[PDB]
């Protein structure tokens, strides 16, 4: 059924897995038009279908053309999502096809479950968690890839870079969602808080910087207490 | 007109013919059911005073043979008995007219109802939903399982509709998921009407067939098809008009014959919600949309 705190170490198990988000496929600016109506402009877009066991991402480029003439397009968006990561399973090899995907927001569900028909055995599920993958455009290399792209695309990363030769993929996915959580909150402090040291760089084949672990210690802790700064700035607390 | 005559009523028993019902005390003289209207399917039910369980009964027509009842006390039911001997019956029946032991079938001259309720409904294909060839009428019980409610367990005692399935290879065409799934014309049209059914009327008989289950047997699978049927043409952009102002004679007689103390467990609020306020045939049933609205408020 749904995946909450309950089954969450089901998602670090030997059964291959997606998370599909579909938070940053349709994305427009909101501005007046010359005669002082509101019009909206598409920019580019992406889905983000992540295996959180191996930090496989599969991110599809959704080029603005491919709204061109259409209507319903928050609707269109879901569809065109489900049409996309039925097309990537059916890319992969049998052994390399998921036996769940896991939907961030549950109106991809029944698009999902129709696009699958096919995968009979494949089980579309929701998620009780709210998971920061919104986010993922704050991440530099991923925003670059995306508005840069001319045409449909797909690209390909490890969202760990090389963590998991260091830690277990719980607690990989624990950095990523922290650090996520971090940039959507405070998307200027959280990139301070990563890039403030000069003698800390991002390897040209990573997404995030190259920390020791000790160094990963008080990062994760900068941004805890980020966080809870912009919770307390908030609520007023 | 014709007759169902009864051996005897050796337990109490409400006898229902059509939309009517009467009460029969244990050992009553009572000998069967006289002046059913020729032309019509007709359905004979029953409900144990001392065992409401198994509301049950049986569909049939006159014109295919003369059917009679008899309480079978091993097996504890009245059971529809063909008589081949046509001459045996005429005498029989003769005796219990001339003896005054029938109800007459109370139709009221300015009354379509029944008619209404049945028009497109036929006993031959009754016989292909429910499967005992041997009989020339079919028994249908409170809890039969339809054939879509066994693959979610006896296949012969089952209810043969016709499975719909809103999320399934048969409704959705590869390359027009988004398209098939919010606008079903084409699982409608060309799947179900041109495929399955051949025309509209035994789609309709169907229809109707499933709400008369769900009405005299509180057949719970016949709710859900009858149900589906529905939300089938309302969530279909494309349906010919003559379909769509039969449906809502259909429906407006429906409504209107359900009593209304059994709205809670008949009607599905998502799918009449659905059907009537946000569907693209929300504006098309109009007769329909008036007496549920005025009726059933709650509902909506
Ligand atoms: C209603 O039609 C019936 O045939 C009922 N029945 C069998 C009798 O009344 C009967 C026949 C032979 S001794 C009693």
Redesign the interface.
């Known amino acids: 059924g749904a995946m909450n705190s309950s089954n969450y170490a089901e998602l670090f198990n030997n059964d291959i897995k997606l998370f599909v988000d579909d938070t940053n496929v349709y994305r427009v600016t909101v501005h007046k038009t010359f005669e002082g109506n509101v019009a909206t402009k598409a920019i580019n877009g992406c889905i983000f279908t992540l295996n959180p066991k191996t930090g496989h991402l599969f991110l599809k480029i959704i080029h603005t053309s491919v709204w061109a003439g259409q209507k319903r397009l928050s609707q269109?968006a879901k569809?065109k999502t489900?049409?996309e990561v039925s097309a990537l399973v059916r890319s992969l090899p049998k052994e390399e096809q998921p036996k769940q995907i896991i939907v961030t927001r549950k109106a991809m569900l029944?698009?999902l479950?129709?696009?699958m028909?096919?995968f009979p055995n494949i089980a579309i599920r929701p998620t009780e968690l709210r998971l920061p993958f919104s986010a993922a455009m704050s991440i530099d290399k991923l925003s670059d890839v995306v508005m840069k792209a001319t045409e449909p695309q797909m690209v390909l990363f490890n969202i760990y870079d090389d963590w998991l030769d260091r830690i277990s993929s719980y607690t990989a996915f624990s950095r990523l969602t922290l650090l996520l959580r971090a940039l959507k909150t405070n998307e200027e402090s959280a990139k301070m808080i990563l890039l403030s040291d000069p003698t800390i760089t991002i390897k040209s084949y990573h997404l995030w910087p190259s920390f020791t672990d000790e160094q990963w210690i008080t990062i994760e802790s900068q941004m805890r207490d980020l966080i809870l700064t912009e919770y307390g700035r908030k609520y007023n607390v | 007109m014709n007759t169902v005559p009864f051996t005897s009523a050796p337990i109490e028993v409400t006898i229902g013919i059509d939309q009517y019902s009467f009460n029969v005390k244990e050992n009553q003289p009572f000998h069967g059911i006289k002046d059913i209207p020729i032309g019509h399917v007709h359905v004979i039910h029953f409900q144990h005073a001392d065992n409401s369980s198994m509301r049950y009964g049986y569909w049939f027509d006159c014109r295919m043979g003369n059917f009679y009842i008899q309480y079978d006390p091993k097996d504890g039911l009245y059971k529809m008995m063909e008589e081949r001997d046509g001459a045996k019956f005429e005498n029989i029946v003769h005796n219990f007219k001339e003896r005054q032991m029938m109800v007459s079938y109370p139709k009221i001259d300015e009354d379509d109802t029944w008619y209404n309720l049945t028009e497109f409904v036929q006993m031959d294909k009754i016989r292909k939903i429910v499967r005992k060839d041997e009989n020339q009428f079919s028994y249908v019980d409170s809890s039969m399982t339809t054939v879509q409610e066994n693959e979610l367990s006896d296949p012969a005692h089952s209810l043969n509709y016709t499975v719909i399935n809103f999320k399934s290879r048969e409704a959705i065409r590869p390359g027009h998921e988004m398209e098939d799934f919010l606008d079903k014309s084409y699982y409608l049209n060309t799947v179900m009407l041109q495929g399955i059914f051949k025309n509209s009327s035994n789609y309709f008989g169907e229809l109707q067939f499933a709400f008369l289950n769900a009405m005299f047997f509180g057949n719970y699978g016949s709710s859900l098809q009858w149900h589906a049927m529905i939300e089938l043409i309302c969530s279909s952009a494309t349906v010919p008009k003559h379909m769509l102002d039969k449906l809502d004679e259909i429906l407006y007689y429906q409504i209107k014959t359900l009593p209304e103390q059994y709205s809670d467990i008949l009607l599905n609020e998502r799918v009449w919600n659905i059907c009537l306020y946000s569907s693209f045939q929300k504006n098309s049933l109009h007769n329909t949309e008036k007496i549920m609205e005025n009726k059933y408020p709650e509902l909506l």
Do not use: I
Request: aromatic letters at 10%.
């Open positions: 269109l569809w489900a049409e029944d698009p479950e129709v696009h028909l096919d």
